[PDB]
């Protein structure tokens, strides 16, 4: 499990792997770990399959009613706060949730990080997962706020590949989304074995 997210001048980049295991047994290789909440919001899956699947679907149930009652989209700081209060009521009962919230706002970009323990922080760069610590170093060596769009696509695609190389619980495919001002857009989805012929060559 390895996800990352970083914002820059032209929006937010979201990338993740697709491998979900069960002990030492790989269950699948085509797990979509970036949950499409809205046409203007995105959420990740990191730690616990049904825990990140249920509560973000319940958050998407809540943000639609907020749009109908007020004739306006929800802000990014609002949706991350509503998710933090729902999980905090089950503190200590044994949940696992480490997702991220992305989306464009009236204040510009938006990037928050929500734990099951109760940590709600903002920031510019994040990397969540078991192989997350392999992704901080290769990202920060190439990170800049004024990167190009095609340059930012190659940075996140490189960083997932180096994480799936060293980690054993990470592999499959590399998904890649791009959050624009109007809404998010799916970039691509590449296999790791196809990148190995490209990068090592």
């Amino acid at each position: 499990t390895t996800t990352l997210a970083f914002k820059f001048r032209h929006g937010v980049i979201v990338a993740a792997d697709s491998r979900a295991t069960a002990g030492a047994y790989i269950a699948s290789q085509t797990v979509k770990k970036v949950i499409e909440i809205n046409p203007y919001l995105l959420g990740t899956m990191a730690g616990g399959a049904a825990d990140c699947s249920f509560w973000e679907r319940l958050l998407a149930r809540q943000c639609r009613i907020y749009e109908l009652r007020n004739k306006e989209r929800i802000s990014v700081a609002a949706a991350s706060k509503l998710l933090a209060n729902m999980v905090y009521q089950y503190k200590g009962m044994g949940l696992s949730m480490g997702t991220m919230i992305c989306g464009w706002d009236k204040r510009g970009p938006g990037l928050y990080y929500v734990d099951s323990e109760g940590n709600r922080i903002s920031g510019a760069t994040f990397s969540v997962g078991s192989g997350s610590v392999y992704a901080y170093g290769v990202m920060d060596r190439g990170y800049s706020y004024d990167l190009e769009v095609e340059q930012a696509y190659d940075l996140a695609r490189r960083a997932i590949y180096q994480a799936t190389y060293r980690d054993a619980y990470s592999g499959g495919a590399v998904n890649l989304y791009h959050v624009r001002e109007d809404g998010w857009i799916r970039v691509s989805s590449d296999n790791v074995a196809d990148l190995h012929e490209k990068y090592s060559g």
Binding site: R57, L58, R61, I65, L68, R69
Partner: protein, 228 residues
């Protein structure tokens, strides 16, 4: 025996709910027409003041992104019914990954309007028109304070309700088109209202199968009125 929801008559029927049907009559008119191309919908505003902000008077609300609404009668009871009708379509998508059909929306709405004295209050004072395009095509339904639910092909309620129905049964047929039914609807409106029909007295709302957006007309409405 005519001041209680817990008391019958020697003949039959409430009066209490019969008095609640009378509360619709002092509302504003509203016309909805079902057509194979989609469902159009019209209403009259009755703006009182120029300082009165016009878009704060709602008559068409958006229940869901493929279902519109219309109302008459008491405004205070209407906002209660619109609230759960947005929630019940939202709870259904949460547990089924699908859009609730237009008929089964009003099933959830009618289950609470028949709870006024049937728990263990008063009945409501508002009639509703529900238009939408579900998997069975375009639909148009109608309810009442008595919870009696029915499907209509073209319905007009509120004030001027009976006078609209006689003229509305004349021009309706099965092979209508959507753009024909829109201009046919507001010929009826300028014959039943007392002010001169302009771009500020009325508002429209349509719905189409491939155009599930746009349950409103924004000044295009000026083009329809100038070619009457």
């Amino acid at each position: 025996y005519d001041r209680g929801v817990n008391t019958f008559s020697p003949e039959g029927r409430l009066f209490q709910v019969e008095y609640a049907i009378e509360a619709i009559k002092l509302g504003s008119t509203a016309i909805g027409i079902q057509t194979s191309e989609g469902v159009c919908l019209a209403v009259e505003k009755r703006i009182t003041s120029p300082l009165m902000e016009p878009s704060s008077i709602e008559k068409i609300v958006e229940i869901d992104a493929h279902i519109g609404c219309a109302m008459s009668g008491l405004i205070a009871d209407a906002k209660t019914l619109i609230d759960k009708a947005r929630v019940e379509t939202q709870n259904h998508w949460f547990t089924y990954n699908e859009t609730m059909t237009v008929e089964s929306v009003t099933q959830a709405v009618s289950n609470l309007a028949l709870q006024f004295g049937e728990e263990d209050s008063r009945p409501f004072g508002v009639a509703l028109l529900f238009g939408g395009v579900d998997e069975k095509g375009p639909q148009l339904f109608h309810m009442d304070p008595s919870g009696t639910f029915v499907q209509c092909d073209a319905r007009a309620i509120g004030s001027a309700s009976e006078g609209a129905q006689s003229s509305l049964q004349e021009v309706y047929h099965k092979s209508m088109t959507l753009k024909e039914a829109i201009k046919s609807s507001l010929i009826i409106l300028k014959q039943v209202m007392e002010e001169k029909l302009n771009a500020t007295n009325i508002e429209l709302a349509t719905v189409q199968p491939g155009q599930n957006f746009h349950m409103f007309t924004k000044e295009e409405l000026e083009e329809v009125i100038k070619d009457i």
